[PDB]
Design a protein around this ligand. Structure first.
Ligand SMILES: *[C@@H]1O[C@H](CO)[C@@H](O)[C@H](O)[C@H]1NC(C)=O
Lengths: 43, 43
């Protein structure tokens, strides 16, 4: 695991995961009042 | 999802439950996946 090795055979700064207990993060907009709009609140 | 719904009220009697109505409100809602078939009280 030496730092002098080329990034193929050198040590792995590497990891993996599956995406309920947790999910990917929701975005959000401004709360656009009074206009006719499409909306999502909490899904 | 394991659940707890809960309530507090004043009373004045130990030896019977009250002939009066008040609903219980959620405080735990956790997707723990553990089934339940037994329990014991702590006091
Ligand atoms: C709960 O019961 C199901 C069968 O109905 C079983 O497959 C599952 O493994 C049980 N849960 C746990 C935490 O073992």
């Amino acid at each position: 695991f030496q730092p002098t090795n080329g990034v193929g055979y050198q040590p792995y700064r590497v990891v993996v995961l599956s995406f309920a207990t947790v999910c990917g993060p929701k975005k959000s907009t401004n709360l656009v009042k009074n206009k006719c709009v499409n909306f999502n609140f909490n899904g | 999802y394991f659940k707890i719904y809960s309530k507090h009220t004043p009373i004045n009697l130990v030896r019977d439950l009250p002939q009066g109505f008040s609903a219980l409100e959620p405080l735990v809602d956790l997707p723990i996946g553990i089934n339940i078939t037994r329990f014991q009280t702590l006091l």
